[PDB]
Design a protein around this ligand. Sequence first.
Ligand SMILES: [Mg+2]
Ligand SMILES: [Zn+2]
Ligand SMILES: [Zn+2]
Lengths: 468, 1166, 50
Amino acid sequence: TTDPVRMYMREMGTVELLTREGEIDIAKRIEDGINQVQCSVAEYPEAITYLLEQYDRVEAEEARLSDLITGFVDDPELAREKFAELRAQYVVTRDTIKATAQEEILKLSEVFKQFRLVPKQFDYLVNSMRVMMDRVRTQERLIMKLCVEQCKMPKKNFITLFTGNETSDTWFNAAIAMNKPWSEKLHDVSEEVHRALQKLQQIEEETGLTIEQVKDINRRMSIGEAKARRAKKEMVEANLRLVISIAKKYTNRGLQFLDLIQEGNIGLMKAVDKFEYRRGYKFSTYATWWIRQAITRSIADQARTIRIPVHMIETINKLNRISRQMLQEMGREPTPEELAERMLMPEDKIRKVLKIAKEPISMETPIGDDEDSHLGDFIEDTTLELPLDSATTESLRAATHDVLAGLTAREAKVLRMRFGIDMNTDYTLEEVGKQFDVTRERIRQIEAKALRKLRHPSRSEVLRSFLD
Amino acid sequence: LKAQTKTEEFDAIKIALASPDMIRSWSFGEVKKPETINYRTFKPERDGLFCARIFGPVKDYECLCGKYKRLKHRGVICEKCGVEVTQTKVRRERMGHIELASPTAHIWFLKSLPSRIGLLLDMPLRDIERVLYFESYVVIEGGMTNLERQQILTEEQYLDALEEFGDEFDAKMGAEAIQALLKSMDLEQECEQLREELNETNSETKRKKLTKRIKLLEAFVQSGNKPEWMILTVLPVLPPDLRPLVPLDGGRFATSDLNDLYRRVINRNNRLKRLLDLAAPDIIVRNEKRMLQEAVDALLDNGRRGRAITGSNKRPLKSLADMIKGKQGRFRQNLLGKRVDYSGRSVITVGPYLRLHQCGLPKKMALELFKPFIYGKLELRGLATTIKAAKKMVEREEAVVWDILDEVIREHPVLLNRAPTLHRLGIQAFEPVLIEGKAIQLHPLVCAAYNADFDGDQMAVHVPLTLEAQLEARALMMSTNNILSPANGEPIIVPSQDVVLGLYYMTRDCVNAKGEGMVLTGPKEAERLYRSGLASLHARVKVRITEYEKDANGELVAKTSLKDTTVGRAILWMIVPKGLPYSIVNQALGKKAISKMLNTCYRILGLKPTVIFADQIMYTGFAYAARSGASVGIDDMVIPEKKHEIISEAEAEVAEIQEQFQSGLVTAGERYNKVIDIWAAANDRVSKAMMDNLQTETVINRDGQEEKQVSFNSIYMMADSGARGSAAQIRQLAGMRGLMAKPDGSIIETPITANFREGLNVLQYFISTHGARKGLADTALKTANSGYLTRRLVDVAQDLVVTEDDCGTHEGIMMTPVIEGGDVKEPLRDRVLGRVTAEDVLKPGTADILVPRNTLLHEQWCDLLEENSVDAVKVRSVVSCDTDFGVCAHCYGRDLARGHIINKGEAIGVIAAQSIGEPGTQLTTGGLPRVADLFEARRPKEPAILAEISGIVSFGKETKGKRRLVITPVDGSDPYEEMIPKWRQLNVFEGERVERGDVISDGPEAPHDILRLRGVHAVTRYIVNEVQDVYRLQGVKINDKHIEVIVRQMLRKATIVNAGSSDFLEGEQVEYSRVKIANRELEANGKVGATYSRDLLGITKASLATESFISAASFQETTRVLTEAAVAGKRDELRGLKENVIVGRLIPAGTGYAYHQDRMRRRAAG
Amino acid sequence: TPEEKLLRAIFGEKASDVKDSSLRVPNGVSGTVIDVQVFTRDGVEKDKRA
Ligand SMILES: [Mg+2]
Ligand SMILES: [Zn+2]
Ligand SMILES: [Zn+2]
């Protein structure tokens, strides 16, 4: 029926309400998903050393502790000694790679999982990971396209010696002599593949992981991330009805209905993001605060044609409340200074605050006759300059220009200099002294006589008429 | 040589769709925030609807931050906050844009009545809307699987189709889908297929829509527009100062609604951007996208969906489409229409002393009006040092300035205007005369053209600033240059009332008066006799007079005689110039004769002698009327002595018929009409009684017993002279007044037996009220209706202007006297006057050409036609003129306020409409609505039917609801058989031959037929003769010319029949077409030329088609016009009037006609 | 601007920080003053005349 209010009401009404048990189900799914990515982050060597390089910048006064960690499971001293533990577990696991290492690589993860990272930092890690995987995909697809598409080799036979290695020369130089139909064709592109293999094998140096593992790890991460959003989305969809129930209170506050319910939906999104079901707090009354918070916080900001800071808004509301009771309490209405004593502040601010708080009047407001004459049609232009004046400006130029030719060439130059007449800016009488080489008092005398010469009327009768 | 890049003087204009990059070209920055002003310091918040960085400095030549305040620094972009320091004027120009997250539909192309996106994709509207709201999925580029390209799927159905075919099939939903559709669309391929399919199937239902669609497509292809552009990527923002936030008194602010709208569009948009980076669920981002769609739609044109309401105010906020739109079309040039400087206005008074070329102007008004002229003149002679000192002088009102004003006033015409401007005489130029007092004085003779009474009407003044305007005013709009109505050549300067009452009392004669019988040498000593008190103004006297006749060859002959006349006529002769014979002043000089006097004076001596003549007539009329001491007393109204008896006899009649109804001898209805008839006859009886008594009752004595002449009683002289009053109104004063009518329209059978000289009782007055009330109501409403008529007329004509000199066609229409049922309801001499002969006309014998081929027929030539008995003359008309895109002056006529043939370039369309419209106030089937029906071509309710083709006809088949009529031509094929319902009584004889266009029944006939069956000249003759009947019944003189030009515009379009260049059935300009088959008649194809059929369009329908779209957006519905043009990329070349007025350049007519001509040839040339 | 500044310099006038809003009799109308009323905000000191 269009009217987008309806096509929403009907689109969400399909989603079935969550049972109190179903809520924990979804919340449980979230925990698994995130813990997967947490564990997946713990399994990246570069992810540890980077955190190390960051704390070494913290102890070197190149950063602050607030810009890196939000705290662990569970103060500068505690932070310092906790980071030492991480560094400790890294330096053992590092040298044990000579098979058995795995048991210690498993413990290095555990300690790292205690760190609750700042969201910005966490995002950068994952970004670094996905960017590293782009770097791997670049080389994977290059070596594939340089063989299959260019040199005409089937992909069926291209993957046999790839899996498990994709670094060393077992596949590239030992498979071209096999005399298969696709074998002898691989020589033309050899120069381009083997030189691009550099970054491919370098990744296992930087990241300290064979190209094998590099895909797996962030694949589980991808899976986990998907699961998280899946569940969280699911949760939000279940509680849309709650948002609707809250926004129906705030309707006429000056924002549209669908505007309200959308802003509230974001609040609900935040509520899911920060919710922990292990606390036993019913999800309804926990999200209500977040949803209600978003609505008001939005209404305060954008609902006005002139944005006002929050504290200003709250001030205004307090006045309405008093004016309500005091309307009938006083039998007339509180005097402009009445609410002033009731309110904390200097109390003369009532006038100022009350003025800027007012909403602008529609310039299209019809006034009179019902005719197309509208308020905006009556607002005159004050920034323009009337022609009856502009004519006198062009004249005054011709005036002073005439009267400055009646003087000596230096009096005109000195007077045109001391004022902005036909020149950029103007020059201080000391500056003028530098241009003429005879300086200080000398110039000032000349100025006096110049103004004096225009004072006694022959010159004077024309310029005096400009001041009325 | 290189063309240009910077500012030239543009011709034409183009309109089209806007690319996203094209929108970005105008934008000097993206508005990223709903913020307006800082809220304390009211400076604009940066990157907001009001932004110094994006748009412009708040104050002239000053940086926002304030670092660079000096007027020297100009092209500097401030390093702190980038603001190029420039005039604040640039905040009125620079635009902006907004990059929308999701695509958005343009409400104009979605919801315009012929939905553009819909018929471009050949897709229904409801489906397209269903896809925009994410209420269903639509296929795009379906490939070969299961599915149509435009097919729509549901939730489950899309899912099933995807599991079967993963790829090689594609479907989207929402705005992105439609945009994908439009981009994927290949117009060339669709065009070819549609051409074949058109040919294959023959059905009217099928190919009507078919041809409509194909036209759009090839147009859209030729346009240069790419379909994707109907979906908005980038949204332009209007410059801030066009929706200002400007402060008000008391510190409150006021701003345009667009801000409230624009703000909304941003927020929702921004939120959507946020909702993408937050990975929200589908159900939400979908709702947000719809919300964005609603906001954009509401922004562009509000009211086509939900009608969003402005903040805190119930009244819906006005959107951008409503700024252009309005009532009607555009606000700018439509009434009304912009205020104008150098003007004023006030109450008007008489000023009988004025010459006809001048007017009294209040001192104060002229001072404030000419202020710049006065300032410049004061220091040109050196009475003021500088312009300021001059200002102080006039502000001090120093005595010396008044003489300087006499200089700037002397030769400097001013424009005077009255409230209901109808014909061009509603504005006239005068020479200003400085007058003490605050009232405008207006020459009495002009009071007729303005329809300006003195009961307090106010008039407006305009100063002609530019030199060309002074000379236009003096040579065009001047009072003395228009003395004649453009509607008919009769003088509109005709003396009004007091003046003609003077001349009537002047030349008149009683039976015996002082000086009767004596003789005088000449008019000089005649006045000497009168003024000295010896002789009475009217007495029969022989005096020697010298008259003149120019009957020689360009030479005035003189002849003297003793004329038998009166003293007054003798005195009056002093004014009559030269070549007029004394016969003209020897009569009683009523208002009718006194007009033909001035007319002849104009057609003989020319313009200049007539003017000074007219002045003198006014002066003497007022003067002598004052001497006369005419008055009106209560004893001036003479009631018949026999009235009471007449009432009684008629009173017996009613009781006789009543006695017949009581006894059943007569029916109730028959009684009513009868009684009503006897009372009516009685009124006539009383009227022609008091008229006899009142008219002649002066009975006076010369040397004998008695004699009787026309009465000198005051009120008769008024009515007789033609000054004021008429037999109808007089009848109401003395004799009984009428039989009034009860509200339902019936007429009460007990008339008003009393009159105004006697008293009316309670009932009689109360019954009188309805007539008064209906009178006032009818006029007050019909006044507005008349105006409406002129509106449609000037719209349908307008751009028609005299262009060529002689188109050189022998064609024309046959002008005969109207000869209606009696003798000559209007003569031949009036019908042919001032027109041009189509071909030479014969005497009764031949090889004798009286009037030779095309010659202006003036007063002598028309009298030469009257000398001979010639009853019929064929005359060139504007309807037959061969000139394309205009009328040749040779085909029009002479008519103007001047007697010369119409000049090259005068705009006849306007004056045609004005001439028809101005008298429309006096009209009341029949009346003013009858005229409107005629010009609208409307087919009547129960029309007649004309024989489709000549030859013997007969009746065939039987009664199905139509009893077929079968026509049988002699030589040609029979097959024409028309289905006529037989329950309408026929006329056509079943056994007789009827010519095509004969009467097959009775009743009115649709002029469409008359055009089709009888021909062009026939229908134009029908219109002019019928409409002229309507007007002439009311006594309105309107020359047939004007009606003919409207007619020509009625037939502007025709529908092609044959082919070989353009489309079969297209209605199109006969100008374009005829010029196209005349070009084809030679060169090109040997002859491929196509046959057309002239069409008849009603006035309101014919005005619809105008090449220039800027004109159409004015008086039509703005929204549809802009869209329908924007798709085709139509390029408006101006060339017309309406459009040139909007853009504010010289009208391509009159004084401007030289300009456009000179430019038009420079164009499309080297 | 430059030339206005020279004008004040020659004639030595101090251009005020206040602009003149004073109520003056409309053009052309002339009469006698029959009354004066002074309304004042509550809390601002009434001037002498008031
Ligand atoms: Mg009036
Ligand atoms: Zn700056
Ligand atoms: Zn012609």
